[PDB]
Amino acid sequence: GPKEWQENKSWNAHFTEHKSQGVVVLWNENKQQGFTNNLKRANQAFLPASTFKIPNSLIALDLGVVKDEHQVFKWDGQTRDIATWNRDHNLITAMKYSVVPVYQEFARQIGEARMSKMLHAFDYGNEDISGNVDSFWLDGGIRISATEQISFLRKLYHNKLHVSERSQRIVKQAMLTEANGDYIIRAKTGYSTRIEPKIGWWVGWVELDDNVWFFAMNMDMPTSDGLGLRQAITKEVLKQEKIIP
Amino acid sequence: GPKEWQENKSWNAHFTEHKSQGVVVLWNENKQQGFTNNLKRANQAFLPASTFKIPNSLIALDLGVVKDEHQVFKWDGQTRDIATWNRDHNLITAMKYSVVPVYQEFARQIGEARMSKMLHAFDYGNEDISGNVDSFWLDGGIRISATEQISFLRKLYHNKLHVSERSQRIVKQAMLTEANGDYIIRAKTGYSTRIEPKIGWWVGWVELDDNVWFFAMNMDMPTSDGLGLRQAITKEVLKQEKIIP
Ligand SMILES: [Cl-]
């Protein structure tokens, strides 16, 4: 009979067409079945990089470090390389622009003891925060696979994580990335550059009228020129599978 | 001193271009200033029609008539003219497709006494539910102006309505209409055909990185042929005012 995870290597053509390598993992929530081009890489655990802004936001909100999605975290005045970071932000825009320094401040206020307790409660990856409390998701010990991202995201979708329903609703609002009359995408990008292998991530889900498709993808990212392929390759897979037009 | 409300008749060109008549009202939240092509019509009261699905959703959620945005409202098996109504719905899809029969059932469960009490607590329009308990927003005594729609929507945006924060967050989720890297629109269409003057509505807001623009428009709508002009004319005004690209 059928397997929980089916391997579809035809999606490799989307990576090869773009001279790239990686994995797309999909989970059909109604069917309770998943699909991927590479079962091994789907289960390979990597640094989460800015995809960690999902659990970091949940923890900050539940502890009151972030009061709500409108609270302003003023720019500290240091001019950084990414121009969108050199301004005031709230939770919505800090997630949209992947504003690392805002989330580093959240992490310092959370502190290592509460951060570790929460990640254990979340069953998140290898639950390892070794390194600096304000950078472990970039260059410390935490590792999470694409299938583990999906497991975590499904809990968040269903408000089943061990934080309040309010915290989960606010983070799902902040994850809003695209919406039209055909679908809604709630998702978070990531770009791991500090420790090899350099990779890009996109994790989240596609809401349809009558089903939800969870997704997690990562791909080799030797330079920043390929960052747009995170969404583009995912959408090519979604289009091939008739999930989006 | 500066003016809270300013009339801009140049927006009438967007109505004339489409052989139409109506009013667009905008509110710049940061500046606390409003703008409209027709101050008189902006303040005249009309049937809300399906824009009433906003308060109706809030009341149904707060009373527990609707448990959450996933609860299924099974199709009653009666084939109606609008094809998307002839299927099961949840709160998200019932809003999206403006599924009147689902909301008529909500209104019957809410009942006259609680519906009236809630509309008074919301300061919603003339607060008058005279007429049939399950159609008064289509052919009863309730009336609301475009400026009153904005005032109600601003309360919803700020979680200031008397119902729970949870109920307000769920309805704002269900109002999601469009989202991209430039803006998020949360809104509700309406179409009042049962009592003259027949009009179309679009009410909601545009979320930017650092501001929110509330909007409420109504326009003469003698047939369904022009329904798309509700969004099209609003977007022409938003583009003219540099709110969206
Ligand atoms: Cl949302």
Side-chain angles (χ1 to χ4, degrees), chain B residues 203-233:
Chain B
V203 309
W205 61 80
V206 184
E207 303 179 6
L208 303 181
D209 283 352
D210 61 356
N211 201 4
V212 182
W213 283 88
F214 295 81
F215 68 84
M217 78 88 70
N218 62 67
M219 62 177 290
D220 299 354
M221 193 64 60
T223 74
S224 58
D225 287 354
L227 283 173
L229 298 173
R230 299 172 296 180
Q231 298 97 331
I233 293 172

Side-chain angles (χ1 to χ4, degrees), chain A residues 173 176 186, chain B residues 173 176 186:
Chain A
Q173 178 187 350
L176 179 56
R186 302 186 187 278
Chain B
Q173 176 182 354
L176 178 58
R186 303 184 186 279

Side-chain angles (χ1 to χ4, degrees), chain A residues 173-188:
Chain A
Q173 178 187 350
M175 287 168 65
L176 179 56
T177 297
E178 189 177 2
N180 56 44
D182 298 320
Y183 59 83
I184 298 164
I185 294 173
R186 302 186 187 278
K188 183 71 201 73

Side-chain angles (χ1 to χ4, degrees), chain A residues 57-190:
Chain A
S57 298
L58 290 163
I59 297 165
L61 285 156
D62 218 59
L63 295 174
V65 170
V66 173
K67 299 177 187 179
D68 59 46
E69 68 275 24
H70 301 313
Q71 183 180 8
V72 178
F73 302 92
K74 289 173 53 174
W75 177 40
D76 66 8
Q78 297 184 25
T79 295
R80 297 179 174 82
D81 289 339
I82 295 171
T84 58
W85 294 7
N86 306 320
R87 65 183 74 154
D88 295 353
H89 281 288
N90 59 35
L91 187 76
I92 306 299
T93 63
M95 188 174 286
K96 175 180 178 178
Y97 298 109
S98 301
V99 190
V100 175
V102 166
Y103 276 84
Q104 294 184 298
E105 179 67 31
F106 297 166
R108 292 190 289 268
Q109 296 187 30
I110 292 160
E112 60 87 43
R114 297 193 293 184
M115 185 74 80
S116 178
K117 180 167 177 280
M118 284 268 188
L119 291 192
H120 177 65
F122 288 170
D123 201 26
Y124 184 91
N126 70 352
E127 307 174 15
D128 186 338
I129 70 157
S130 71
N132 305 130
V133 72
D134 65 356
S135 74
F136 63 88
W137 64 95
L138 304 172
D139 54 19
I142 187 76
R143 299 291 186 281
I144 189 170
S145 69
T147 56
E148 289 164 1
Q149 295 261 25
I150 288 178
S151 293
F152 172 76
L153 292 166
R154 291 182 63 232
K155 291 166 201 143
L156 174 60
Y157 177 90
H158 290 297
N159 301 321
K160 286 303 172 74
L161 295 170
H162 298 340
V163 289
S164 69
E165 181 182 314
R166 172 182 182 272
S167 294
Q168 293 175 86
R169 288 187 179 279
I170 292 172
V171 173
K172 286 180 287 186
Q173 178 187 350
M175 287 168 65
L176 179 56
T177 297
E178 189 177 2
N180 56 44
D182 298 320
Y183 59 83
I184 298 164
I185 294 173
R186 302 186 187 278
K188 183 71 201 73
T189 55

